[PDB]
Amino acid sequence: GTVNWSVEDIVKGINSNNLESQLQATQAARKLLSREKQPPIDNIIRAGLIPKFVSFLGKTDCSPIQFESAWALTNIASGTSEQTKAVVDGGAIPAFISLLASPHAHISEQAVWALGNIAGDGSAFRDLVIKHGAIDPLLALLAVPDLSTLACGYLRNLTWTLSNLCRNKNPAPPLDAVEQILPTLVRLLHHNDPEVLADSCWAISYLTDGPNERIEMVVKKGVVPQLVKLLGATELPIVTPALRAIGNIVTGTDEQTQKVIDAGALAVFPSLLTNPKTNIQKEATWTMSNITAGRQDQIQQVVNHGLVPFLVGVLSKADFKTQKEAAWAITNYTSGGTVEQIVYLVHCGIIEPLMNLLSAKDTKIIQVILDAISNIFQAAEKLGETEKLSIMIEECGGLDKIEALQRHENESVYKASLNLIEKYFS
């Protein structure tokens, strides 16, 4: 019937004055665009069909052609920026927003999907969707006493589209729109469906990536405890965005970080710092580095949860990027910590793995490690233990590496290493 039509046939059917022929041709187009291999998006665009599909969106009297043209346009907007732009240039945004109020749930769902793709292109189309007024009808779709009454797929598509309205930077979404969306996001963040939870966590992670004022908007809604709970989920697709959000949050002020600590996040980190997914270990160690950049009481809470041996472990054996984040964690720790906390760090066996990392090719991590070693030596100076630390660094073969760094291409490395060997290692 409508299977395997040529673009030529589709054009001939859409250009007839027969509404049913147009319906058949539009369904054929939808089926072309929903095939698994190489959907002919550009051929459909070049045929001039987008304006006709957009016009079909407004045929309230023919519900099926509304649905079919909505689906076809959704799939065109799913492609490149140019193809999405072609959909927007056809006037599709206000037409889809009008469909959001359709009495047919499959048609409003399809409009939700289309707006999601359009907004997902980037900041400009996101803000253009917001300017046309999509947020009010979108949120109205979710204004029900219990989300569990909504169809699973309907709710999932709504959540994903909302997440796309929170997505992208330069610029971030309008602050007023974020304020309008956040309550519904919190509600979705407490829903029992894993996909809804994943997309809500992604939305929160987008909103928390920016200046501390944005983080404050999110944190004021009290979502941090729920984020920690989700940080402990079995579903990796949930843990990943939850951990991203928690990290973003701890990039902010010390009080915002303390909200994460008080919610119990640190208790989850023994798993995260040994998680078998490299990305999880990397994100978790980055989060750790930003916590050890906090107050001394926050460093102390890191100590109390027994996380220092886990940092020693990550520094000893892990993907190199994770090791780089761990080096940052150590340098922040040693710069902000007390002498007692730095001594504890040394008693956990930081020196040997720290030295093994001085043979690395990355120049920046060398700078970081030399800064950490310097900090530890300042603590030792306060205790008169500089000589014991010198011996300890020598016995594991570290002095050799430090000396070899004197003859290094980078100037900062040169200065730091020469200063270290001159002031401590004779």
Binding site: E36, T84, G116, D121, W160, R167, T251, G252, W286, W328
Partner: peptide, 19 residues
């Protein structure tokens, strides 16, 4: 001391419907 993400993988921003 605090380092932000941009300083120096996500889900797909677009979804094609195949149903």
């Amino acid at each position: 001391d605090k380092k932000r993400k941009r300083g120096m993988h996500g889900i797909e921003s677009k979804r094609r419907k195949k149903k």
